[PDB]
Design a protein around this ligand. Structure first.
Ligand code: ZN
Ligand code: ZN
Lengths: 121, 161, 116
């Protein structure tokens, strides 16, 4: 049962539901692949994102919109929780919330090739 | 006027914000001081974070990227015109800085997600023929299988044989 | 896209991807052989979490001669223009949304398939 004014409007009851329904990346992710883009700015997938942010390989994870929006999620908290969850071995250059594709680029810096698949899995 | 800063990181951030405001020459037509405006946006970001850490650098980079967005030249025009004050622009979310098309798309997707997650109202024939024994209101719904009746006001359920 | 398995040319075993830590380039080496061939796709692996797959790739034209299967005269072919078409739902288990109907031209040497 809902205690606050949220008890009335379905809108402010919805965010309680999102704060309760267990939602892992698999629910909002769409397509997860890997790439040995030899430099952050190499951008073999043709992206202008790292160039403004200025490993030889990365995880790329184009997330879902109609699943991320329906949860009122953002790349901000996703990247925060990633870096907090695995520690600063991982760096995540997330996209912006203006582009059409909701990519995350994930790299490691300091048995590695399989290791991106190991952490993603 | 934004205070002068001696910090090399803050000076580079002001220069990069001014360069983002110059993108597309809109500052010439408006006659806005893009150096002063870049300094005020940086100062407002610095007043919130009070440190030059990765959080500050990420925040400045996000603003530069949104000002340089070729799909949203209106955001940069609105900042140069003073429709968005430097302090507000320094606090605004990536959702509030988005293009009007992307804002409306997100609003529609959010509204559709809410509509899809709304439980279907249980069907039946609405009728005023039945008076609820608990609340004495006539707003009831019936279904025959024996007539089952539900009061729409207090949720009381009963049957007739 | 994807990436296939490319097999070694000597042992015909599976080539694993390996970075050239000298030239900074992706290779495909073998486990049993010492066969280093130079990558082109720059990709290791993909994974469609959406499970989006086009059924028209899986629908085989031979289904048209299935007597068990409903025939329409309400959607003509596009290449030839036959009137007759069988239609069905996606037999694949990934179909909880896809009650969408897939149609096949009931005309030999055509087997044109489409979805409306
Ligand atoms: Zn071999
Ligand atoms: Zn045909």
């Amino acid at each position: 049962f809902l205690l606050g004014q949220s008890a009335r409007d379905a809108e402010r009851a919805k965010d309680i539901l999102c704060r309760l329904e267990h939602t892992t990346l698999r629910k909002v992710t769409a397509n997860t692949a890997i790439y040995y883009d030899p430099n952050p700015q190499s951008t073999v997938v043709a992206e202008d994102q790292e160039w403004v942010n200025v490993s030889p390989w990365l995880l790329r994870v184009e997330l879902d919109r109609k699943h991320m929006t329906d949860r009122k999620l953002t790349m901000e908290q996703i990247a925060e929780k990633i870096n907090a969850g695995f520690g600063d071995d991982l760096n995540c250059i997330f996209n912006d919330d203006n582009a059409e594709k909701l990519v995350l680029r994930i790299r490691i810096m300091n048995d590695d090739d399989v290791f991106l698949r190991c952490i993603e899995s | 006027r934004a205070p002068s800063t001696s910090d090399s990181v803050r000076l580079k951030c002001r220069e990069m914000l001014a360069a983002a405001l110059r993108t597309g020459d809109d500052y010439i037509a408006i006659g806005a001081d893009e150096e002063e405006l870049g300094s005020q946006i940086e100062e407002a970001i610095y007043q919130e974070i009070r440190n030059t850490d990765m959080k500050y650098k990420n925040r400045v980079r996000s603003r530069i990227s949104n000002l340089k967005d070729a799909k949203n030249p209106n955001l940069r025009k609105n900042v140069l015109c003073g429709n968005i004050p430097p302090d507000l622009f320094a606090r605004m979310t990536a959702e509030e800085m988005a293009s009007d098309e992307l804002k409306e798309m997100r609003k529609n997707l959010t509204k559709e997600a809410i509509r899809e997650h709304q439980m279907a109202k249980t069907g039946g024939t609405q009728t005023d023929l039945f008076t609820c024994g608990k609340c004495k209101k006539k707003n009831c719904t019936y279904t025959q299988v024996t007539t089952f009746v539900v009061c729409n006001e207090c949720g009381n359920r009963w049957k007739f044989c | 896209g994807f990436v296939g398995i490319r097999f070694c040319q000597e042992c015909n075993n599976m080539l694993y991807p390996k970075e050239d830590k000298e030239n900074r380039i992706l290779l495909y080496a073998c486990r049993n052989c010492d066969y280093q061939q130079e990558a082109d796709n720059s990709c290791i692996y993909v994974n469609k979490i959406t499970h989006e797959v086009d059924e028209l790739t899986q629908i085989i034209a031979d289904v048209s001669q299935d007597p068990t299967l409903p025939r329409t005269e309400d959607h003509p072919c596009q290449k030839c223009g036959h009137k007759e078409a069988v239609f069905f739902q996606s037999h694949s288990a990934r179909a909880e949304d896809a009650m969408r109907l897939y149609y096949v031209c009931t005309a030999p040497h055509c087997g044109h398939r489409w979805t409306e």
